[PDB]
Amino acid sequence: SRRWFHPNITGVEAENLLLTRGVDGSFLARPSKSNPGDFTLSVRRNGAVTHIKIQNTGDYYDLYGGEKFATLAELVQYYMEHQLKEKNGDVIELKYPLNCADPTSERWFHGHLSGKEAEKLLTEKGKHGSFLVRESQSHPGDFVLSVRTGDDSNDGKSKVTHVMIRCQELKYDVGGGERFDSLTDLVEHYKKNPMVETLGTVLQLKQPLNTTRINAAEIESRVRELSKGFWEEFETLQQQECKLLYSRKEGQRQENKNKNRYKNILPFDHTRVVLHDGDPNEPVSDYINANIIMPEKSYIATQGCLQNTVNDFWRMVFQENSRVIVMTTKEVERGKSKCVKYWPDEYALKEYGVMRVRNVKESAAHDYTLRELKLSKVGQGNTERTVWQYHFRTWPDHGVPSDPGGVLDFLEEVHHKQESIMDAGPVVVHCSAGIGRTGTFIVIDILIDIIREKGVDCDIDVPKTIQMVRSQRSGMVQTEAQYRFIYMAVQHYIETLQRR
Ligand SMILES: CC1(N)CCN(c2cnc3c(-c4cccc(Cl)c4Cl)c[nH]c3c2)CC1
Numbered sequence: 001s002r003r004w005f006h007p008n009i010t011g012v013e014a015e016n017l018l019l020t021r022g023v024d025g026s027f028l029a030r031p032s033k034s035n036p037g038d039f040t041l042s043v044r045r046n047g048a049v050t051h052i053k054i055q056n057t058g059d060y061y062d063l064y065g066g067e068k069f070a071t072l073a074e075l076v077q078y079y080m081e082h083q084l085k086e087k088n089g090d091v092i093e094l095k096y097p098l099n100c101a102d103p104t105s106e107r108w109f110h111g112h113l114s115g116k117e118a119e120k121l122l123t124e125k126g127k128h129g130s131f132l133v134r135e136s137q138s139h140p141g142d143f144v145l146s147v148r149t150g151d152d153s154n155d156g157k158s159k160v161t162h163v164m165i166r167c168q169e170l171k172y173d174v175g176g177g178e179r180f181d182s183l184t185d186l187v188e189h190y191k192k193n194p195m196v197e198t199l200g201t202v203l204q205l206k207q208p209l210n211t212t213r214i215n216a217a218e219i220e221s222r223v224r225e226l227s228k229g230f231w232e233e234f235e236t237l238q239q240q241e242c243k244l245l246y247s248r249k250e251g252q253r254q255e256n257k258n259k260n261r262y263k264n265i266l267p268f269d270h271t272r273v274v275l276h277d278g279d280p281n282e283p284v285s286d287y288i289n290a291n292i293i294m295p296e297k298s299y300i301a302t303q304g305c306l307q308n309t310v311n312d313f314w315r316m317v318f319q320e321n322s323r324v325i326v327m328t329t330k331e332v333e334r335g336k337s338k339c340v341k342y343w344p345d346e347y348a349l350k351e352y353g354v355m356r357v358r359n360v361k362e363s364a365a366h367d368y369t370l371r372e373l374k375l376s377k378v379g380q381g382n383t384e385r386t387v388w389q390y391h392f393r394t395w396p397d398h399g400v401p402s403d404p405g406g407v408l409d410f411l412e413e414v415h416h417k418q419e420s421i422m423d424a425g426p427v428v429v430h431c432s433a434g435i436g437r438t439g440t441f442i443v444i445d446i447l448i449d450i451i452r453e454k455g456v457d458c459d460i461d462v463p464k465t466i467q468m469v470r471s472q473r474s475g476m477v478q479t480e481a482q483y484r485f486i487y488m489a490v491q492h493y494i495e496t497l498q499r500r
Pocket residue numbers: 104106107108109110111210211212232233234236237238240463464467
């Protein structure tokens with residue numbers, strides 16, 4: 001849980017918080033109330049507050065006077081372990097997170113909800129240790145912790161307990177003992193130190209009640225319901241990114257600094273693609289900014305090549321036996337290189353280090369170009385394999401497509417290509433940093449794959465899938481707009497399947 005993030009605060013409320021409850025070096029982050037993808041880092045320095053803008057248009061968090069980051073938690077970790085200056089050059093220190101007490105972005109918080117409502121949800125969907133916190137209806141201002149415990153039919157082996165939580169002078173308690181500054185501090189305490197009943201039952205808080213898993217048949221109702229919040233479901237997912245600060249030590253090595261498009265957007269050690277059979281004369285020849293994404297068909301999520309990583313990209317494709325590449329940027333957007341050209345012109349042949357690529361044929365569709373490429377190792381003719389590059393060309397410079405039909409038709413074609421090729425390795429997917437559009441395309445592909453095989457009567461869970469992909473590369477799916485677009489794409493896919 002991301003405690004320095006305050007979801008429902010104004011700029012002057014942030015100032016007053018830092019001036020009355022903080023010291024120099026205190027900080028918090030907050031969203032804008034009107035623009036998603038605008039965020040502010042508010043910091044106290046010399047008895048005054050500075051507000052530093054962070055923009056996200058879809059590719060990364062861009063901190064004014066700072067770096068680009070995959071997540072706000074990775075941003076805060078970076079500066080608390082390092083570097084941040086104003087317009088002028090004066091150091092801004094991030095020392096002390098100012099904690100937020102607001103529970104409304106927690107997975108377990110249900111606001112207005114009755115005991116019988118909570119019981120029926122825990123009976124229908126909960127299991128042992130499933131829990132929620134709700135507002136007390138009998139005692140205004142108070143709250144109730146509802147917990148299922150049991151074995152795992154309705155044979156009385158399981159039950160729902162309700163523990164009253166008093167709120168007294170803005171502190172929270174369960175009738176005795178410690179008084180907490182927030183419901184989150186209380187929940188974390190009793191997660192670690194569970195309550196035991198008189199006769200021995202342990203009220204284990206194992207997991208919040210799942211409210212996001214839906215039957216695919218019922219996508220339209222969920223989308224209609226979320227259109228009046230997508231922002232609120234997204235920000236609850238974003239609150240969990242504190243849990244995904246896995247090590248990125250290889251990417252952080254001096255010898256690998258030049259191989260990262262953005263110095264702080266780095267692959268997790270535990271899922272990075274390790275490159276073998278490198279040049280012995282190159283000191284570190286095993287690194288690429290790329291991760292294996294395995295749903296729990298696989299993917300490699302990677303960045304747009306740099307001039308000096310083109311040969312490594314082709315080493316990767318050959319080694320992993322990838323037969324399909326998805327590119328989700330033009331080479332240049334808004335005057336900036338987003339991905340260098342790493343393929344030859346049509347009918348041309350180029351050598352990229354030890355690899356040889358022929359561009360056999362390009363075919364233009366409305367939304368994309370297909371390039372049929374032939375990849376082989378120089379000196380070894382029988383290593384030739386076809387690699388099909390699907391270059392999506394119509395994604396807008398900021399935000400998302402207004403209709404998902406283009407992306408869905410593209411992904412359907414990519415899927416059938418991949419499935420047509422026996423023993424094809426992972427599908428390579430890359431944009432600019434390889435986390436925003438790349439994460440959106442991979443998550444849509446994962447969700448659609450379920451419905452393709454199991455039909456419309458299968459369970460999907462959009463944020464749970466995203467969190468699972470985010471544990472394999474930082475910040476996969478960057479914005480609310482992409483989040484909503486994933487739902488919209490899944491909805492549109494379900495409707496075309498129902499029309500058949
Ligand atoms: C009544 C509610 N306020 C409605 C929103 N509810 C809700 C629950 N879960 C999530 C997740 C989620 C799902 C699966 C795994 C992970 Cl890690 C996450 Cl974060 C993302 N957004 C969520 C919103 C919480 C109750």
